[PDB]
Design a binder for this molecule. Structure first.
Ligand code: NA
Length: 139
């Protein structure tokens, strides 16, 4: 529905999910226009902090990472999906595409335990997301 090229998405998503690809635990995607396409902004080892480091105040981005949840045993792998619309984005037409683009992205990034929308780094706090995961686990 969005008109964006998502060709770059599936590969790295599979990398994050793949337990045997230990070199990739997160990915951050950025958004290019004319032509409208997602690209990889960052990808590697790490989690939330690494994602946060890659999120830009003037950008529309998406992120996806793996984390562990458990009390402990059973420790289980959980996946976090974040949409990001920085408070510095200059074009309100780009802000407006967020939800339709997000929907297309979630059809590729279909395996997640929590979804968060953030506009500030304060929206993304490890303990808060861990507690949310622990909650969705026992629902
Ligand atoms: Na991986």
């Amino acid at each position: 529905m969005s008109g964006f090229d998502l060709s770059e998405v599936a590969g790295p998503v599979a990398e994050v999910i793949d337990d045997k690809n230990e070199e990739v635990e997160f990915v951050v995607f950025g958004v290019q226009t004319q032509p409208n396409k997602l690209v990889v902004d960052a990808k590697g080892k790490g989690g939330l902090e690494e994602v946060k480091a890659a999120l830009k105040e003037d950008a529309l981005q998406f992120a996806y990472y793996r984390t562990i949840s458990g009390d402990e045993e059973s420790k289980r792998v959980k996946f976090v999906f974040i949409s990001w619309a920085g408070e510095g984005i200059k074009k309100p037409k780009l802000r407006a595409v967020m939800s339709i683009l997000k929907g297309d992205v979630k059809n590729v990034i279909n395996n997640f335990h929590i979804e968060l929308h953030a506009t500030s780094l304060d929206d993304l706090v490890e303990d808060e997301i861990a507690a949310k995961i622990k909650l969705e686990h026992h629902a």
